[PDB]
Amino acid sequence: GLVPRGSHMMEILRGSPALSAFRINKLLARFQAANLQVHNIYAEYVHFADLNAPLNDSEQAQLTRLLQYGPALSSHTPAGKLLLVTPRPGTISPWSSKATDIAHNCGLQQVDRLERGVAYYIEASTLTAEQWRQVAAELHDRMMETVFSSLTDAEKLFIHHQPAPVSSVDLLGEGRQALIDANLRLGLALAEDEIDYLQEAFTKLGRNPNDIELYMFAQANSEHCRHKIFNADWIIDGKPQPKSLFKMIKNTFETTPDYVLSAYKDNAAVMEGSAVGRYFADHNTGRYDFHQEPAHILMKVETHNHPTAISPWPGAATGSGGEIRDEGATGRGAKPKAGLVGFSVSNLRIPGFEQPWEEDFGKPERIVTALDIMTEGPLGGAAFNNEFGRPALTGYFRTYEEKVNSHNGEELRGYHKPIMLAGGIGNIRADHVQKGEIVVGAKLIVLGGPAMNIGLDFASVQRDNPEMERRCQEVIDRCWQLGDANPILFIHDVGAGGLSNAMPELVSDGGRGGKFELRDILSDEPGMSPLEIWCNESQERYVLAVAADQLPLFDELCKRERAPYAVIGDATEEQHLSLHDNHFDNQPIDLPLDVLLGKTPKMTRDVQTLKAKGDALNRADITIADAVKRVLHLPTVAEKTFLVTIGDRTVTGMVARDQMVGPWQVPVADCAVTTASLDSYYGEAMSIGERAPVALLDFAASARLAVGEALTNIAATQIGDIKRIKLSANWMAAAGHPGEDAGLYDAVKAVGEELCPQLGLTIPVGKDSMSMKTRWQEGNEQREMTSPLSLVISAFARVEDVRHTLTPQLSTEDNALLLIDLGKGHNALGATALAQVYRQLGDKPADVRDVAQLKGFYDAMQALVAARKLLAWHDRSDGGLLVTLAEMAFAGHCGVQVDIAALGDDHLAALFNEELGGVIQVRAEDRDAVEALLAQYGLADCVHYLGQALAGDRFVITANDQTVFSESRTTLRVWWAETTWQMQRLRDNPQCADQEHEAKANDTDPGLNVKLSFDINEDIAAPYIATGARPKVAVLREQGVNSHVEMAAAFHRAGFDAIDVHMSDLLGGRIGLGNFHALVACGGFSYGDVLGAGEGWAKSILFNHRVRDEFETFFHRPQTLALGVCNGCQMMSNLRELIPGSELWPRFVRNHSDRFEARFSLVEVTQSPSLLLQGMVGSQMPIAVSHGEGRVEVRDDAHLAALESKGLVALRYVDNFGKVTETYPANPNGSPNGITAVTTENGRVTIMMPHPERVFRTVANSWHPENWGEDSPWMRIFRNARKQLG
Ligand SMILES: Nc1ncnc2c1ncn2[C@@H]1O[C@H](COP(=O)(O)OP(=O)(O)O)[C@@H](O)[C@H]1O
Ligand SMILES: [Mg+2]
Ligand SMILES: [Mg+2]
Ligand SMILES: [Mg+2]
């Protein structure tokens, strides 16, 4: 391709088949059911290259080779109608940014931009023009993509547009009527008092406002930005209120300032951590050292509700992406550690799996369904968390949509506009918690990706480029790692409002002003107006202030990490903001700072209280037996595997407690626990409390239950003082809707003035979304879908001992199951899982019955966690005591024999109430002392003995001589799994979804088990470490690598001197491989896996003659070792032509499941010449798996038979039974003969997909036997490396 494109050339290069077997079969099945007779369909990826200069033969062959990737699926000769799906014109895709990155790092600077599209070849025959639009409609996303009829039509994606001029609003010429026209035209949605201020301010300044100044003002004075509702004065029932909603949340800090370092001063909150060894690479030596200093914990939770309703993937991705920015931009620089994902939607209504409570109430044409949000949403959120490298450790998922009789009578209550919750923790240094002072003349920089026209359904469609944020994070990292030499004076994140809010906020919080230059900002689309360059909500951008003489240091750091930066302005003494344009010689902005932060009348909400009545439960169709079946089928209660395994849970190697529990990997962990470092047992803990449907009956109860559930979910961890637990209050409501407003005040008062100050719980952070409703026309009537007052409390805490955390995993040993019913026998059935499941709302809901007992409960729980008196713990949340005992039996793979006689005469209420508390398991001999301890905290009238956990499959609930409920634990396990099975069927490979489900039906599954061939505690590297001689290992990384710090910590424990070797360090000629005898290619998402996972990394070595030679000399040397875990396994398997004895090596392509697999799979060490696996052969241990492209692919059977004969296989996936299996998920990728590790003939180079570096510590394993020391068996790989070098 060299078809006419201005001064540039557009090149058409073919690619591999885009869709695999089942995807094509699903498309054909989707066409049939729409009366579109399509015989066959074939999809093919096709690349488009915009070249600025010419391309020679060597360079042409190099471009063709970069674009050869993915699964080697059989290609078809194009036949039928061509339908090309490319992104919408004027839009650059995340693929395009990352693929072009590779071209530039491979020496092909002639390439301006690289875009991909999917060519569909439809053999349908005889379809009217209408039916063709229907076919095209099913092949693209109307919000992001467009359909073309020719491959040459893709020229529209690269059009050069002339920079648009600044428009002026003629206030001085047309009057106030010019601002009324601008408020309508530009879409500023300002109030009357706001337009009044804008009239006066510009009459004072005596000039016409530019469209840019007006748009900036709108973004700065929107309700969300200024937090109008939260700062507003209130009048409840004709009675004026003393405090505001924000001031009531601040009361929790005034009554409990304990352990808080920063609150309401940043875009996150900081609390006290522990003095642990912070591990990183020294700025001078390049060596990774342990820095013994206080590692303080930071936290923040965000929402991105409306964007998720329009486009799920971007809404969820940028939701976690903006939150990751809030964390990194805390103080003078911080580092994100772990994260939490949350969701609330309407009824799923899965085709062929409709539930008895689900009814179609319609939905706006403009928004997407609850099911589409649950397919594409979790994937987008996980895509960011996976590609950036932060583990998604805990969370919630709730479904609600019903014609309920609430506060405003009978109406539809649900979430058509969902709650997309994204949050997490991070670590920060003590001298970086506080924001530094901005000096006059401080250079104001924009760290991050080149802007595009994103924030202006269409304008609600976002963009996620997570590798860009990794690079940005690595710059923030090198900065706080410099100690007191940290260049960053002040750092703020970019988000709502774009640069128009971020910059005037950076200087304002510093007390300074600022002079900018529009042409110094990095732009990816030239045609933008000054309005668009400054007000666009483009992602992965940060704003920062750095001293003038610290600029050469910032440049050196950014270029080495490949993170784009641009100095756009200077900080000024005078409180004034100004933007300059060098292209037009004018000044787009010229305003005093107060003119922007300009106030008008403070909001006053004079509201009335409304209260629901709601009748008692109609128990006609309710039988305890059907109630159990119906409850376990409610998405809120049901297994959450489809939300857990799609997101990384093992990165940083600091993960102690992930969602998956026990040998059976059941996702029932109540909270998430991470270790503070890689050298301690101190840590962080995360939990979520939320009970939104209760706000339909009692507003104050739902709020209190959210604080209560967060506390009960956190209770199994060794925290100590309750004042150590810090809360985050995210409020979701529909402000204006009858009764919600007055009910928001009572809910904020209930937690802010009453419950939290009484327990000692601080709320140092929060956020608000105040328009949770959707309106549309159904027939001729208007329908509304209003959300309940949804409070999502996220509890954060410092851990004293990571090892002492309890899980729902029951022990079959002599035991006693004791229930702590904090509900005091109230047994409330209103607004429960049971009620919803039977299309009802109920009578009276659950609540914190006694404040002193909820505190007493926690203190008692802590007393038992420290004294090691508990065997297991699980709290009562959704679906009551039944679901708690069921989920405990699922995790323990055992039986339960309980008696609920002393729990009232109402058995349905005793089993299904969502009151606080739960079930603790103790040793039989310890029953008396534990009851006595629980009595010391005044909980004797709450503690009821239930029964015991028995070995078996029987789940029995009795009441004296009578049998209340008896069923097979496996039947309940499978029923509870049915929702995730169905979600994986429509999203992943149905073959894989079915195999995962059908393995749960086998009660004979022994779970993950261990077989060891060597001594796990024998440190064979000890005589070597004792000499003091520490050999150096090149811990290799490319832009987008995240699993390198723990890889360095693994070799360090073995006795190595781990050094940070970036690819830029080799390409820039700073570091050479000659001084090394050991190299390790690390894991991550280099280039966001674009152009094939690990292919861009390998080709930047291969095409660069100097670096290519540097690597070949390394592998060809007699005494060198090399490791390639994940990503780096994919990189090294693409470097075959450089490594000796790697002729028979396979490739690692997309998983058979077509999904990212974050598993804890069981492998076995097979006989291979591998020098890193010596002494380990025959062993069977669980390993950390986190990959989406790890399937071993051979060219034919000759390649596989030859690989097996040469004996190059090191690790194979085995099921829990012990045999080599190709069944999912025991084998997560679908690799032939279970391969995930191969080696060379000499055995010096070994590549593997699993992560031994993320699990080198026993506490870092999701499951491990209760006798294992500090080291896991995987610590031997690194020690074998030390003994081999001598
Ligand atoms: N959206 C999500 N993303 C990741 N994990 C989730 C999500 N939703 C739920 N989980 C996990 O599934 C498990 C059970 O969830 P759930 O029963 O709703 O929590 P709870 O224990 O408070 O009742 C937990 O381990 C939780 O962290
Ligand atoms: Mg919950
Ligand atoms: Mg729970
Ligand atoms: Mg639950």
Swiss-Prot record:
Q: Where does ATP bind?
A: 315-326, 394-396, 669, 877
EC number(s) for this protein? 6.3.5.3
Say which species the protein is native to.
Salmonella typhimurium (strain LT2 / SGSC1412 / ATCC 700720)
Q: In which pathway does it act?
A: Purine metabolism; IMP biosynthesis via de novo pathway; 5-amino-1-(5-phospho-D-ribosyl)imidazole from N(2)-formyl-N(1)-(5-phospho-D-ribosyl)glycinamide: step 1/2
Its recorded name reads Phosphoribosylformylglycinamidine synthase
Q: Where does Mg(2+) bind?
A: D670, E709, N713, D875
Question: What does changing L1172W do?
Answer: This mutant has the same secondary structure content and FGAM synthetase activity as the wild-type protein and exhibits almost no destabilization
Report the Gene3D superfamilies cross-referenced here.
Answer: 3.40.50.880, Phosphoribosylformylglycinamidine synthase, linker domain, PurM-like C-terminal domain, PurM-like, N-terminal domain
* Domain of life of the organism encoding this protein: Bacteria
Q: Report the active site residues.
A: C1126 (nucleophile), H1251, E1253
Q: Which InterPro entries match?
A: Class_I_gatase-like, FGAR-AT_N, FGAR-AT_PurM_N-like, PurL_large, PurL_linker, PurM-like_C_dom, PurM-like_C_sf, PurM-like_N_sf
Q: What does the UniProt keyword field contain?
A: ATP-binding, Cytoplasm, Glutamine amidotransferase, Ligase, Magnesium, Metal-binding, Nucleotide-binding, Purine biosynthesis
